[PDB]
């Protein structure tokens, strides 16, 4: 969990946005301006990232629920696979508004969702109508899109790992209102004050995003190793 200060360099972590869209709070992590862009200071970046990795690793050891948030369509697919690979569930695209707080109200929603899935191999064959059938399938699709990937939790998650943060400012606000710790790949235009582990990367190119996903994925497997057995053969 000490990704070479050079691997990210080729990934694209150094290229932020332009000044026209630059969070002034991010000054501590600036190196200059290539073609009026803002090159994140990787040397400043890297200790924080590795530190959060360790933090997140001890979490998974205590068996604290982790979570990830979907972003752009490419990001969402990548997040899903990495999450499904181990555990820790995952959001997809919308964050379903006030999921946190209204977690009890969306719990009833999850209940109805699972029933429909179960009754999707039951109610479909019997009493099928050219009208009701389309109803069932379509609603399930919509529900699945976002609610799917969270239905497993069956309770309040104990951590969150979002990306960019700005695109999901709503998610961070609710998490701050409960104590649930979070991690965010803040970029040159993202308010990091609400984050407890500022990862000053770049939510872009996917390439670099895939690096962050791969990294954390590895740390949570170390947590599972403490939950299963040590390395040997």
């Amino acid at each position: 969990a000490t990704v070479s200060m050079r691997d990210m360099l080729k990934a694209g972590v150094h290229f932020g946005h332009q000044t026209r869209y630059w969070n002034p709070k991010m000054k501590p992590f600036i190196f200059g301006a290539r073609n009026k862009v803002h090159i994140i200071n990787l040397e400043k970046t890297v200790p924080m990232f590795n530190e959060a990795l360790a933090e997140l690793n001890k979490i998974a050891s205590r068996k604290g629920k982790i979570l990830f948030v979907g972003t752009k369509r490419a990001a969402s697919e990548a997040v899903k696979d990495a999450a499904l690979s181990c555990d820790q569930f995952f959001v997809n695209h919308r964050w379903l508004g006030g999921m946190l707080t209204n977690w009890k109200t969306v719990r009833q929603s999850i209940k109805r969702l699972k029933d429909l899935e179960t009754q999707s191999q039951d109610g479909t064959f019997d009493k099928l109508t050219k009208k009701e059938a389309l109803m069932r399938t379509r609603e399930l699709e919509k529900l699945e899109n976002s609610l799917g990937g969270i239905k497993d939790m069956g309770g309040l998650p104990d951590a969150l790992f979002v990306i960019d943060a700005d695109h999901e400012h709503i998610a961070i606000k609710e998490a701050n209102n409960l104590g649930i710790p979070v991690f965010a790949i803040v970029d040159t235009n993202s308010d990091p004050d609400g984050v407890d582990f500022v990862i000053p990367g770049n939510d872009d190119a996917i390439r670099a995003v895939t690096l962050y996903l791969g990294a954390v994925a590895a740390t949570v497997r170390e947590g599972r190793s403490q939950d299963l057995a040590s390395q040997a053969e």
Partner: peptide, 9 residues
């Protein structure tokens, strides 16, 4: 890609 020396500077 930019040289490591300039990047580290």
């Amino acid at each position: 890609t930019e040289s490591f020396a300039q990047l580290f500077e």
